[PDB]
Amino acid sequence: MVRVGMRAAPRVSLEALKAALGGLKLSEAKVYLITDWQDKRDQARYALLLHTGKKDLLVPDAFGPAFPGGEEALSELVGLLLAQGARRFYEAVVSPGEMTALLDLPPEELLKRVMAIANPTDPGIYL
Predict the structure, then answer these.
(1) Which domains does the chain possess?
(2) 127, 75 Cβ separation under 8 angstroms
(3) What are residue 34's DSSP bridge partners?
């Protein structure tokens, strides 16, 4: 599993994701948005675990209203994945104090953990 982007860096991480993704089609992919339990969606941050079915990619918590330019970057990120054909989105919620620890878990463990707690989500909520 590859890891691109950096924590709290919306624009740089979106560009790194675009570079790794290229023109890859994602019709059969599963997109997991990993967020922290906060009071409102306006203070939320998001990490990305993109499971294509043939390879996985992880971007740390760099998106969302928690960061300046993050709300726009989250909308553009969801847009980019939809543009490439992605259809299945999910959300996994973790405690604020455990997000980093979660993202550092071995590839196999992270994927298992995320799929275990994620719920299907409507991508429109992130726009």
Answers:
(1) 2-127 (3.40.1530.10)
(2) yes
(3) 47, 92
